[PDB]
Amino acid sequence: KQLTKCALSHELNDLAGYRDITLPEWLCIIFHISGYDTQAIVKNSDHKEYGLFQINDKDFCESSTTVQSRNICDISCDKLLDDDLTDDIMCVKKILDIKGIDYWLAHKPLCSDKLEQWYCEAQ
Ligand SMILES: [Ca+2]
Hints:
The protein has helices at 5-11, 23-34, 86-98, 102-105, and strands at residues 41-44, 47-50, 55-56. By secondary structure, the chain is an alpha+beta fold. The radius of gyration is 14 Å and the shape is globular. The relative contact order is 0.20. Lactose synthase (LS) is a heterodimer of a catalytic component, beta1,4-galactosyltransferase (beta4Gal-T1) and a regulatory component, alpha-lactalbumin (LA). It is found in: Secreted.
Protein backbone atom coordinates (compact mmCIF):
# COMPACT_ATOMS: atom_id res chain seq x y z
CA LYS A 1 0.00 0.00 0.00
CA GLN A 2 1.38 3.40 -0.97
CA LEU A 3 0.43 5.77 1.85
CA THR A 4 0.32 9.54 1.95
CA LYS A 5 1.97 11.85 4.43
CA CYS A 6 -1.51 12.69 5.74
CA ALA A 7 -2.96 9.15 6.19
CA LEU A 8 0.37 8.04 7.63
CA SER A 9 0.45 10.92 10.13
CA HIS A 10 -2.91 9.64 11.39
CA GLU A 11 -1.78 5.99 11.61
CA LEU A 12 1.40 6.89 13.49
CA ASN A 13 -0.45 8.63 16.32
CA ASP A 14 0.72 6.05 18.90
CA LEU A 15 4.31 6.02 17.70
CA ALA A 16 4.99 9.75 17.75
CA GLY A 17 6.71 10.76 20.98
CA TYR A 18 8.08 7.32 21.86
CA ARG A 19 11.78 7.70 22.75
CA ASP A 20 11.24 11.41 21.96
CA ILE A 21 11.04 10.89 18.18
CA THR A 22 8.52 13.36 16.82
CA LEU A 23 5.85 12.82 14.20
CA PRO A 24 7.50 15.03 11.51
CA GLU A 25 10.81 13.29 12.11
CA TRP A 26 9.13 9.93 11.53
CA LEU A 27 7.38 11.10 8.37
CA CYS A 28 10.71 12.37 7.10
CA ILE A 29 12.59 9.16 7.97
CA ILE A 30 9.90 6.85 6.54
CA PHE A 31 9.65 8.82 3.30
CA HIS A 32 13.40 8.50 2.91
CA ILE A 33 13.61 4.79 3.62
CA SER A 34 10.40 3.44 2.07
CA GLY A 35 8.71 6.25 0.19
CA TYR A 36 5.59 5.51 2.29
CA ASP A 37 5.20 2.09 0.70
CA THR A 38 4.15 -0.55 3.25
CA GLN A 39 5.47 -3.15 0.83
CA ALA A 40 9.03 -1.86 0.48
CA ILE A 41 11.79 -4.49 0.55
CA VAL A 42 15.46 -3.59 0.21
CA LYS A 43 18.10 -6.26 -0.15
CA ASN A 44 21.33 -5.58 1.68
CA SER A 45 24.58 -7.55 1.96
CA ASP A 46 23.57 -10.25 4.45
CA HIS A 47 19.84 -9.56 4.98
CA LYS A 48 16.69 -7.81 3.78
CA GLU A 49 14.68 -4.94 5.27
CA TYR A 50 10.94 -5.03 5.22
CA GLY A 51 8.03 -2.69 5.06
CA LEU A 52 7.37 0.88 5.88
CA PHE A 53 9.95 0.78 8.68
CA GLN A 54 12.54 -1.30 6.89
CA ILE A 55 12.85 -3.82 9.72
CA ASN A 56 15.60 -6.37 9.01
CA ASP A 57 15.36 -10.16 9.08
CA LYS A 58 18.81 -10.57 10.56
CA ASP A 59 17.85 -9.43 14.04
CA PHE A 60 14.24 -8.35 14.08
CA CYS A 61 11.81 -10.39 12.01
CA GLU A 62 11.91 -13.92 10.68
CA SER A 63 11.62 -13.97 6.90
CA SER A 64 10.20 -16.81 4.86
CA THR A 65 13.71 -17.58 3.65
CA THR A 66 16.76 -19.56 4.76
CA VAL A 67 17.99 -16.62 6.88
CA GLN A 68 18.66 -17.46 10.52
CA SER A 69 17.03 -14.59 12.38
CA ARG A 70 17.48 -13.66 16.04
CA ASN A 71 13.86 -12.43 15.56
CA ILE A 72 13.78 -9.96 18.44
CA CYS A 73 10.31 -8.69 17.48
CA ASP A 74 9.18 -12.31 17.41
CA ILE A 75 7.32 -11.64 14.20
CA SER A 76 7.37 -13.05 10.68
CA CYS A 77 8.45 -10.39 8.18
CA ASP A 78 5.39 -10.90 5.99
CA LYS A 79 3.30 -9.22 8.70
CA LEU A 80 5.42 -6.09 8.09
CA LEU A 81 4.27 -5.94 4.46
CA ASP A 82 0.50 -5.56 4.91
CA ASP A 83 -1.52 -2.35 5.53
CA ASP A 84 -1.96 -2.90 9.28
CA LEU A 85 0.88 -1.02 10.93
CA THR A 86 -0.18 -2.17 14.42
CA ASP A 87 2.38 -4.98 14.72
CA ASP A 88 4.98 -2.98 12.78
CA ILE A 89 4.76 -0.21 15.38
CA MET A 90 4.97 -2.83 18.14
CA CYS A 91 8.27 -3.97 16.65
CA VAL A 92 9.45 -0.39 15.98
CA LYS A 93 9.04 0.33 19.66
CA LYS A 94 11.14 -2.75 20.53
CA ILE A 95 13.84 -1.55 18.16
CA LEU A 96 13.70 1.94 19.70
CA ASP A 97 14.23 0.43 23.15
CA ILE A 98 17.12 -1.69 21.96
CA LYS A 99 18.88 0.25 19.18
CA GLY A 100 17.20 3.63 19.36
CA ILE A 101 16.41 5.88 16.39
CA ASP A 102 20.02 5.16 15.42
CA TYR A 103 18.67 2.00 13.69
CA TRP A 104 17.09 4.20 11.02
CA LEU A 105 19.42 7.20 10.94
CA ALA A 106 22.57 5.07 10.77
CA HIS A 107 24.84 8.03 11.61
CA LYS A 108 23.55 10.03 8.63
CA PRO A 109 22.30 13.65 8.67
CA LEU A 110 18.89 13.06 7.09
CA CYS A 111 15.81 14.57 8.72
CA SER A 112 17.67 17.03 10.94
CA ASP A 113 16.46 20.36 9.54
CA LYS A 114 13.18 22.02 8.53
CA LEU A 115 11.20 19.15 10.01
CA GLU A 116 8.10 21.34 10.21
CA GLN A 117 7.88 20.87 6.42
CA TRP A 118 6.71 17.31 7.15
CA TYR A 119 3.47 18.05 8.96
CA CYS A 120 0.28 17.03 7.17
CA GLU A 121 -1.41 20.32 8.02
CA ALA A 122 -1.74 20.56 11.77
CA GLN A 123 0.19 17.44 12.69
CA1 LIG B 1 1.64 -5.11 9.63
